[PDB]
Symmetry: D2
């Protein structure tokens, strides 16, 4: 087939990793799930967390940078989707670094399993 | 006594809340520890996490918005402070809201205990 | 009033802390929310986590021992309460210790706010 | 080569899964790291957490059962390894199930990377 495509079902779930700042080992990395191309956030269906791993070149092992839980999905004493409060599955991880390396991010849908994305961090 | 003062040690640790955006429900809140006075980030001594709580006016109960773990503090197989990777204790909680309310932030130093901060969310 | 009572609404939410073993600084502490006196675990209503703090005598500061998220509340692609999988809001924290002290536990209902319980750990 | 061997370093780190009870849906799973060969728990080097994933047969997706953070590693204001408080890397996930399935556990050393373990849940 000449026409290439992509499953929307997958795209709305991948943790998209975007480096924002990396001047002089001062790094700010944003991860979101469905940035402008959105995944539902209901009491029954939501992204629960995102986790970010970084492995600097010449490091035998990878390091977890941090983890971000998105705790609120509209539940209240009046029923599901009534609180008004919904946490958005975007996180910014700010960290120091002395070398370039690989970034890997993980996310979780409460009904659609575990997901992963990768990206490169080169020190500009 | 008579001569009031301010503990520098206390401000080094307080989670500071900074609303960045509240227009039209779309809220973004920055929390950070050590903003004005730098808090150590060494394998020995560092800020472990920040949790954001929000209670909209009208609601009898508060909701956790989310939690952010800051996991790297320079430990490698080479020893303490040798990995050159340190997660900065600062998070951005993005979330949808439909009423104004109260923001409480908590935070933890691995040697200096638990910490609390407060702020008002004016959904103007 | 001669007759004393207690709100059931509160009891089903308090983190009950029970020391199981403490021989020689080898400590095992169990925390549950509504042990035989149960709190609902539905996709809309559930206990999200329990956290355990310990402060040993003669320690200026308290230490978080650990935290236990209960991630599964029956949600699946077929709707709420269909997965068959529900995590029980009980956790065991095993840890070492050299002195007696105070235990404090925290729990979270997703629609009924934050809760706390206290207990003493003496080293037998 | 020709002479197969087993890495002692690898077993020190593997999360080991142990079903304790599965009768009638009521499951309890112990996960631990360093069961047979002790893994260091020092401020410098220690196991940060364990996460349990479960995928019942029939279900297209896995569910996180829960996560357990092990937060204390002896750090005090007096320095490294001086608090005399260390969280043992071992958790008990209790949960209700209605079908047999697959158990995957993950775990993290602050200097020796991420780790994975597997086991079958026979809801006999
Ligand atoms: Fe999904
Ligand atoms: Fe401190
Ligand atoms: Fe409740
Ligand atoms: Fe290790």
């Amino acid at each position: 087939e000449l026409f290439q495509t992509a499953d929307w079902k997958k795209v709305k779930h991948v943790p998209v990793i975007e480096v924002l700042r990396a001047e002089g080992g001062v790094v700010e990395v944003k991860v979101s799930v469905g940035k402008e191309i959105p995944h539902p956030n209901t009491t029954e269906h939501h992204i629960a967390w995102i986790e970010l791993v970084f492995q600097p070149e010449g490091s035998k092992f990878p390091y977890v940078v941090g983890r971000a839980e998105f705790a609120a999905h509209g539940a209240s004493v009046d029923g599901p989707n009534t609180s008004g409060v919904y946490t958005d599955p975007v996180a910014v991880f700010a960290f120091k670094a002395e070398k370039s390396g690989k970034l890997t991010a993980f996310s979780y849908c409460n009904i659609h399993g575990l997901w992963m994305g990768e990206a490169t961090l080169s020190l500009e």
